[model samples]
Target: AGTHDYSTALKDSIIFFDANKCGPQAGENNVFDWRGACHTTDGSDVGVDLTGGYHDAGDHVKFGLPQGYSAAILGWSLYEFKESFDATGNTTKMLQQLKYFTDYFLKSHPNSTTFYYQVGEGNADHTYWGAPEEQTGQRPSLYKADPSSPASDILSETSAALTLMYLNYKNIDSAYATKCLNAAKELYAMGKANQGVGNGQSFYQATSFGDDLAWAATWLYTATNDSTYITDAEQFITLGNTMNENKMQDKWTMCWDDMYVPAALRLAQITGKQIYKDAIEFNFNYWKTQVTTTPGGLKWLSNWGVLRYAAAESMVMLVYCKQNPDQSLLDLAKKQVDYILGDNPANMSYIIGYGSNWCIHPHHRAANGYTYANGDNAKPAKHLLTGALVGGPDQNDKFLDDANQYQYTEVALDYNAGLVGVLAGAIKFFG
Candidate 1:
């Protein structure tokens, strides 16, 4: 009952916080991302900030506590990174972030005593572009290719299904939830219909993608007591198993990333499938092999290639794995936390920060060692909060102003929320 009440309170707090930050119209039909400053601009339409775009907003909604306190006081400090963009807001991007929030909410609040799906119609169909192609009054050529292709559509459908499952299980009025499930099922079928074309990576594209699908399936299984979702989840686990059959074949060498493995494990839980479990275990083992011991703690790898958000994700998964009493996972998680807190040479101590701003410093690198502006550099009004690091030497000078003083900081809602969720779960389970 406390969990149910806490969830409800958290939802209300988010609604209230949004209202207070941007006014009563924050959730209005037309009001988008608090007047367009919350996103990134690339001399064209605006996109969400680096930390704001993917998991950060989802993490914020997922981990938010009463009065926006979050689990750790440090997590509460991240609320300042929230910003809106200038464009009409991309439904695809917004939906992606929403999926993360919805999936986690469904998992954490299985009884669904709180947090129902809120459905509305939108005109935009494509997502890669910052805004709808027509809104810019430009040719279709102006828009980015639809990143929400078959693969992305599968992920989105799973997300929507999970949201519906939550609403139905919560016993809320769920006509919309039913509709959403149907829509998601249709998309899933479509992806299956096109199986070989480009949806090859559909099951393993991002760290959390598979996990989100598995979580969605678990919700559906719980709601209807049906085996369809369970069976589908098993099939997903099978696919991963086939791909990772040989753990050492370049493909099996798990990178220290977040999106793929956590998702695989979540799926494993729903289906009670071994392959999904193996993938996660293999990756955990692989990362452990890579960790380099330092004076204060262990160092797996530098912050060079790892997404700052994934660091927090490593913490979340490690904590989640610990719930089942896996010493290997617990050790890896603690080592990762210590690495960031202790030996990270980049000064990447905290969980989240103004990545879009500080990323401009010469330190951050994109793929292929290319150090160019990430289009996020254009958004100046945004502030680094919570997981954001102080730019100067000591913690006192860690603000997000000068690049010389501040080299690297973790500033994103996803990272902070993940840290909070993991810590909260740890306290509840182990305290």
Candidate 2:
């Protein structure tokens, strides 16, 4: 019944992170040799070692919200589907990939109340186009969240991500796990004290922080089994629902901006409560009946990041199906992933280097190997960004594999994070 080699999909999805690695690459487990150490002096201005983390997209900026969100999602995938990764022979590699982000988070949080939120000016970083190692000179500026400049959104999401890191690494490395847990606790407390409002940069701004608050609280509860955290999470969930005008109850897809799906799912599993399960089902029912879908059967939640939303929703559905065992949920999850793996109208794999007719012109600065003199599309991407999932086609199923069409061609950390879980789930069930 498996139409795709999900084992390979799981393997490649994990491999995609190596290409996006920032900072020292000499000894790192980077498969891509061309990606050398870049942005080594990221925290020199502030004198903290913010040397490593994944880039947001094609550019070099390190946006904390989405990076933390990606780590939590990838960590969730590894936590739930370790067998899939183990079977695919990528457990060690995935662990290394995760450590990259967690290590950076640890560095970013040099102090309890002070958490560095971003490391590169988005506007300045995007002005150049070339490999990361070659882009020298003055490093971009840094941004932080402290007592004066509170950012609950970034702080709480990072808390959740660090909590996941703690859960995953507890048995393997007790010391590292404890450090992560301690940082998580401090970050959560700071974010909670500041309430659920924070500053966000341009490009990806936070509309509400309730989802992050709930997600962080739920993760802390998951790690500690503390009923106090549970109470906190329950309140945050209600607050999130009210803030989003009850969208988390039935409408919006799980994304970097919204994490109510995972929070509600974890709460449902942890407490075995009807309220959380009902929330999950309400959202799923909308996905099944009320949500719009492309003619090719992809769930078209929004015009931007088309497959990212579909894959994210599919990941949620699959996780829910694993716990509840519903055939329809299983089918819905499979159909969306299938469309991503070349079952759609275009019959094109949006993931780079996966199948025949995969997109090569991803809107990546380094991989594309462009220079100011040579122009944007001077030549084909010098390096193959294997397993990187590009933002997919329009609602009409029309996809342009052009570097300029970044909406459809850009590969990003958030875009592939959910797909990692979907691929792992496919390996577990479909394979």
Candidate 3:
């Protein structure tokens, strides 16, 4: 079943983050020759510099939910699979990407009570289908959440992200780690004090913040050994912050808006509590037995970004199986990884530049190299979107490598977040 070099896939998957990076790339070790300085004057009008972070999907908007969540997941993977990263000589590169995200996050949270959650408007960004560098139009607004206008989702997600960043860099860059830790504490407080969803666009609206709060608190507990954070985490779970609309367990994959499963798994690992352990097991059993599956064996969740959801959930199950030592869970996780790596009906890899038959025409603007006058198909993509995992097949296991279909072609930051973990774990356990 294991036919792919997962270590190479792990290394290449990180390059996807580099390709999605927004803001100035000056004086930094630029890996992609196609990427250059873009969106440099991000926060000029408000007299603040919101110059870094990543574009959401193929668009130029820097969505705080996915950005923060993606960074945290990346750091978590590194923390759990440091051996895999180190063995592949990717630790330095991974740290570089994490630092880039944290640096922009630090800028977003200028003060304790205020945080800029989004850098560009979604409608405006989506209208222009060209490279970010070639754009001259005005991105006139910067969205934020403050004491007066609060978004618990973005706040807690960013808090969790920065806390993980602090943990990763505490020994390497002490000063930077200290700033991340301080910012995380203040952001989490702000999230708890004012609990409401704001600063998110319609496209990326937050449904609930309970899971986020629990996630942040759990990480904070791990970082500081603070019982207060653990109490908050358990209390938040008891408050039903992680349930679906019917008060049932959340069956969705851990994505930008949901962290229920991941938070539960982490809490299970940390506290060894039966409640947390059962919470994770419930979701895993649902995924294994009841969830819809393609004939090719993908745990089909939604039509859009179907592979990403499966990949992300595989990471969750892999993590849960690690402590519990369940062969069934391990087999499911490995099968999903193998499916993405070309064991499916299509015999193609979902990750760009992974196998011989991988995704090529990803619905990305910068990598597509579409100029202002030229159409999307005027020419082939100028740059190879190496390591980017595209949204995959339809319910019947049919896939099209078309740039027009975002559902099957778009590559987002969150899409690759859990993939990094899945690939690493595949190498560590399956190989």
Candidate 4:
């Protein structure tokens, strides 16, 4: 049936049997790294396996599933958790983390969050390091090694707002929803007022903030049926559309990976506005144009090459296409899926090795090259199945091995949380 239940089962199996459970290791006094093994005193030591560590910067903590699961899971988990947890506790944790991240940024240098060393220690100095180079005050690589960058802040804020919005939507408790609503409002305001300028100009960073604001407004409109959310969402959507109109040269020039599509489209759908629709159509068209059918299946943009995580984004796109039912979109999605399942030979192995999992290889370091998709190289890896590359340019490789690697890779709580909504949506619409 092509349903993802089995995939979830596989992920759960990996969680149960294979994942290291030592928790997280303190790299130094305040820095913690989620090692694949238990801790040891020597520098050659691997540390405890923690649940929320892998994608913490990505806020993959809230939702505990991998990307391939579906946003449906993300939505459902938020709804369920809101119902289960006390409103006060949930709001406190969310807001506190938000505050912590914000304060951290204020004290640190501008764009310092994106630098690999700010959040944790020793990573930058490692022999096979793959941290982003200091460029224009921000890391361009989508998979950020440094959690202090402006992009990291934007991503964190976006994740926080989305989680809060999801809770607000469920309406488990009015007071709780109000608190979350307030949080979303503040974050949305921050995003709008900042406008990717001072500490916000990075393309993905700015777009991410915009995406969060749009969602925050949409959720507000849905929850309170207020004109304010609608107006705000419309204004933001209009702005985004305008940016696309003037600056975007090609229809296929997507802002990031597949993750951006849904929020943008959802905003458009909520507003029922033409500009939003046009933007989605333009992106979909762009995706279609990029695919090559030569090697028996679809070939995605060369930059996005990871398996499971990237697959999740592709699934999100397909889910949207299915809901909207654009033939071209559907065709591209199918081709992409087929390409992964058919032609790619490297799509079936685990991406393990030093200096591989982080964003990109350090310019001058000699890497073992065993890590997931060649660290930021233009060329795809020999084993295409590793899901290490979740966002950005090379996202179309879908080999089974790549899916398996993601299936087997440790599931960060935040990554799982993101999947909650995605999976639920798939079930609601597809099933």
> What lDDT would candidate 1 get against the real structure?
0.32
lDDT of each prediction vs. the true structure?
Answer: 0.32, 0.83, 0.83, 0.34
What does the lDDT come to for candidate 3? 0.83
Worst 10 residues of 2 by lDDT: 240-249
User: Please, what are the lDDT tens digits per residue for candidate 2 over residues 274-377?
Assistant: 77778888999989988888898888888778899999998888887776788898889989888888888998877888876888788888788777675746
- Tell me, what's the RMSD of every candidate? 12.5, 1.9, 2.0, 11.0
What are the models' TM-scores? 0.49, 0.96, 0.95, 0.51
Weakest 10 consecutive residues of candidate 3 by summed lDDT: 239-248
Q: State the lDDT at 81 in candidate 2.
A: 86
- What does candidate 1 score in Cα RMSD to the true structure? 12.5
How far in Å is the alpha carbon of 100 misplaced in model 1? 11
Name the candidate, 2 or 4, with the larger lDDT value: 2
Better of 3 and 4 by lDDT: 3
Candidate 1 wrong stretches, greater than 4 Å? 1-149, 152-161, 164-183, 196-219, 240-260, 271-273, 291-323, 338-349, 352-384, 387-417, 429-431
